[PDB]
From a paper:
We therefore proceeded to address the ligand-binding potential of the SRCR domains by adding Ca2+, Mg2+, and a cocktail of sugars to SRCR8 crystals before freezing. This yielded a second crystal form of SRCR8 with the original Mg2+ ion, site 1, and two additional cations bound, sites 2 and 3. All three sites are class three cation-binding sites, with the coordination obtained from residues in distant parts of the sequence. Analysis of the bond lengths and coordination numbers suggest that site 2 is a canonical Mg2+ site, with octahedral geometry and average bond lengths of 2.1 Å, while site 3 displays a higher coordination number and longer bond lengths, more consistent with a Ca2+-binding site. The Mg2+ at site 1 is coordinated by the backbone carbonyl groups of S1021 and V1060, as well as the side chains of D1023 and D1026, and two waters, and is buried in the domain fold. The Mg2+ at site 2 is coordinated by D1019, D1020, and E1086 plus three waters. The Mg2+ at site 3 is coordinated by the side chains of D1020, D1058, D1059, and N1081, with additional contributions from a water and an extra density. Attempts to model this extra density as any of the sugars or alcohols present in the crystallisation solution failed to produce a satisfactory fit; therefore, it likely represents a superposition of a number of molecules. In contrast to the Mg2+ at site 1, these cations at sites 2 and 3 are exposed on the surface of the domain, and the protein only contributes a fraction of the coordination sphere, with the remainder contributed by waters or small molecules from the crystallisation solution. Thus, the surface-exposed cations likely provide a mechanism for ligand binding for the SALSA SRCR domains, whereby the anions of the ligand substitute for the waters or the density at site 3 observed in our structure.
The salivary scavenger and agglutinin (SALSA), also known as gp340, “deleted in malignant brain tumors 1” (DMBT1) and salivary agglutinin (SAG), is a multifunctional molecule found in high abundance on human mucosal surfaces. SALSA has widespread functions in innate immunity, inflammation, epithelial homeostasis, and tumour suppression. The first 13 SRCRs are 109 aa domains found as “pearls on a string” separated by SRCR-interspersed domains (SIDs). The SALSA SRCR domains reveal a classic globular SRCR-fold, with four conserved disulphide bridges, as described for the SRCR type B domains.
Numbering used by the authors:
A (entry chain B), B (entry chain A): 986 to 1097
């Protein structure tokens, strides 16, 4: 429901441990823009989901465009954070992007 | 010289950012036992050396056996420490190991 935020999932990757990053924001699953999105950020996501370490951090909607709101932009994780929510970013819903820039991750546990 | 301790290096990894962990102790480069050695401990070493975050924390002398003293055992970093010296351990030179257990790290900055 609309009171709930701060869940994380990967979609459209064909595997539990890769795909487009989606973040729950006020009942809607939103996406993350690829601006400043890098393997440090992907590693927080991969570790948070128990998927190993980040092998790469694809941009440009490699795993498709989402249909929800764009909720995070210019994420600046160091790679050591325990939650994506802990990393610096632009502020929720503050972006300069479109869904052709939706960010993704490929984690080391893919396929296995 | 023999008065100096508390420097950190990785050796025998083929890259600056992976290898056997070695710790300077009274002028000699010593090793770390793999007992309780995990990715939280590796994360502290990797960040201390400017090598990023930890991919894994290999035990059992993956990067060979050292020849110096075994100086640290049962290291229990939380992951947040800025120095390996901050982490809980068994006490300097207090170990129940041999060099076939020398600990190593593999950090994200390994590159080709
Ligand atoms: Cl993991
Ligand atoms: Cl070691
Ligand atoms: Mg972009
Ligand atoms: Mg970033
Ligand atoms: Mg932007
Ligand atoms: Mg052991
Ligand atoms: Mg430990
Ligand atoms: Mg021991």
């Amino acid at each position: 429901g609309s009171e709930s935020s701060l869940a994380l999932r990967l979609v459209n990757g064909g595997d539990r441990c890769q795909g487009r990053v989606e973040v729950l924001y006020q009942g809607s699953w939103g996406t993350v823009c690829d601006d400043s999105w890098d393997t440090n950020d992907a590693n927080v996501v991969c570790r948070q989901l128990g998927c190993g370490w980040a092998m790469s951090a694809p941009g440009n909607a490699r795993f498709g465009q989402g249909s929800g709101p764009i909720v995070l932009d210019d994420v600046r994780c160091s790679g050591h954070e325990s939650y994506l929510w802990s990393c610096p970013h632009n502020g929720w819903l503050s972006h300069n992007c479109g869904h052709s820039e939706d960010a993704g991750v490929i984690c080391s546990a893919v396929n296995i």
